[PDB]
């Protein structure tokens, strides 16, 4: 989703069984607007 005119992200984005850091390509400014829990779960899935 890089380059889009997105101002917010869905709070249900974290409900993806198979999605890693590489699977989402977005600019970092709008990558933090989502709740911290789903971001931290995504990072937890990035261990291996």
């Amino acid at each position: 989703l890089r380059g889009n005119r997105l101002e917010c992200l869905p709070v249900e984005l974290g409900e993806c069984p198979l999605l890693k850091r590489s699977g989402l390509v977005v600019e970092e400014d709008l990558f933090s607007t989502l709740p911290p829990e789903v971001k931290e779960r995504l990072w937890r899935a990035d261990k291996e």
Partner: protein, 51 residues
């Protein structure tokens, strides 16, 4: 001498993020473009000023 002086590691460390949050390299008043610059496959924006 520009290629030897501007090694790949120095440009890699000099890589920055632009407003659109992507890798950008700024070359200002350099005598030319080092050949090590074109080894930065991760570069997305190339800025050349007064070359």
């Amino acid at each position: 001498n520009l290629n030897n002086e501007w090694t790949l590691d120095k440009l890699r460390q000099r890589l920055t993020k632009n407003a659109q949050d992507k890798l950008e390299l700024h070359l200002f008043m350099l005598s030319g473009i080092p050949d090590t610059v074109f080894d930065l496959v991760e570069l997305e924006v190339l800025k050349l000023e007064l070359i």
